[PDB]
Each structure stands twice: as structure tokens, then as C-alpha cells.
């Protein structure tokens, strides 16, 4: 599913995002511009061998399980696959998780270096929420 920007604001809005851990609702909306364009099925392979799934980008390393990254974890208690859902649930139930864990969203690459500073409330400008 390709969400719309609106769409997308406010299935995080109804999940519990804006402001979760201090991250206004625009910043949680651009990281997932420039992690995936929106796309829920958005997978990419990373050079260690584990992969980022879904409209979040959400790493096998540490949080989900796709049975070929070798010694990784699962701390979201999900298969990886769940991540690529037309439903957004149990990416934003994990995102939790992962913007808890001390680095906030530095987590997400994209976040730093394309959303982090910028005027994040364009990204929700024109919803209503
Ligand atoms: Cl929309
Ligand atoms: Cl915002
Ligand atoms: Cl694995
Ligand atoms: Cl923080
Ligand atoms: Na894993």
C-alpha cells in the first residue's frame, strides 16, 4: 500500500505517535517519506545481510525475525514480514519500541540526516487531524 501523506499522518496520529517520546507527529511522517516513499512493502538488504522492512524501514538485526539474519534478535516479537502490512499496527507498535532504546530517532538514518532540523510541521500541514 502507497499511502497517501494525510492518510499516513493520521493512521500514526491514531496509533499513538505524535509526540510519543517527544517527536511531534511531522517528524515520524517525513522518516517515513524518505525511509520508504510511503510504500508499506518497501524492503531493502543491508551489507551485513539483514534487512529494513516496511513503511518504517525497521531492521532484522535487533527487531523482527526473517530466519536469515544470523544472530540476531527479534525484541519487537514479530516476523518481519508483519511489517509489510497494508495495516501500519505493528510497525508503529515496534517504532515504539526502537525510539525507546536511548538514541531516539537517530535510529532511523534517514531521520538524521534529511528530517532532523528541518521544519517537520510541513509534513502534517493541510491534514486534518
Ligand atoms: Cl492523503
Ligand atoms: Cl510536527
Ligand atoms: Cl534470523
Ligand atoms: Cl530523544
Ligand atoms: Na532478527
Given at each position: 500500500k502507497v499511502f497517501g501523506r494525510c492518510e499516513l499522518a493520521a493512521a500514526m496520529k491514531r496509533?499513538?505517535?505524535?509526540?510519543?517520546?517527544?517527536?511531534?507527529?511531522?517528524?515520524?511522517?517525513?522518516?517515513?517519506?524518505?525511509?520508504?516513499?510511503?510504500?508499506?512493502?518497501?524492503?531493502?538488504?543491508?551489507?551485513?545481510?539483514?534487512?529494513?522492512?516496511?513503511?518504517?524501514?525497521?531492521?532484522?538485526?535487533?527487531?523482527?525475525?526473517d530466519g536469515r539474519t544470523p544472530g540476531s534478535r527479534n525484541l519487537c516479537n514479530i516476523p518481519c514480514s508483519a511489517l509489510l502490512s497494508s495495516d501500519i499496527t505493528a510497525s508503529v507498535n515496534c517504532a515504539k519500541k526502537i525510539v525507546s532504546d536511548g538514541n531516539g530517532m537517530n535510529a532511523w538514518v534517514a531521520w538524521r540526516n534529511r528530517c532532523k532540523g528541518t521544519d517537520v510541521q510541513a509534513w502534517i500541514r493541510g491534514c486534518r487531524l
Amino acid at each position: 500500500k502507497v499511502f497517501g501523506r494525510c492518510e499516513l499522518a493520521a493512521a500514526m496520529k491514531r496509533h499513538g505517535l505524535d509526540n510519543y517520546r517527544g517527536y511531534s507527529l511531522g517528524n515520524w511522517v517525513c522518516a517515513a517519506k524518505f525511509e520508504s516513499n510511503f510504500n508499506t512493502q518497501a524492503t531493502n538488504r543491508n551489507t551485513d545481510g539483514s534487512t529494513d522492512y516496511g513503511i518504517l524501514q525497521i531492521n532484522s538485526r535487533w527487531w523482527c525475525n526473517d530466519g536469515r539474519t544470523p544472530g540476531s534478535r527479534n525484541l519487537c516479537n514479530i516476523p518481519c514480514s508483519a511489517l509489510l502490512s497494508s495495516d501500519i499496527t505493528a510497525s508503529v507498535n515496534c517504532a515504539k519500541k526502537i525510539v525507546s532504546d536511548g538514541n531516539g530517532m537517530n535510529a532511523w538514518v534517514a531521520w538524521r540526516n534529511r528530517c532532523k532540523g528541518t521544519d517537520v510541521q510541513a509534513w502534517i500541514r493541510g491534514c486534518r487531524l
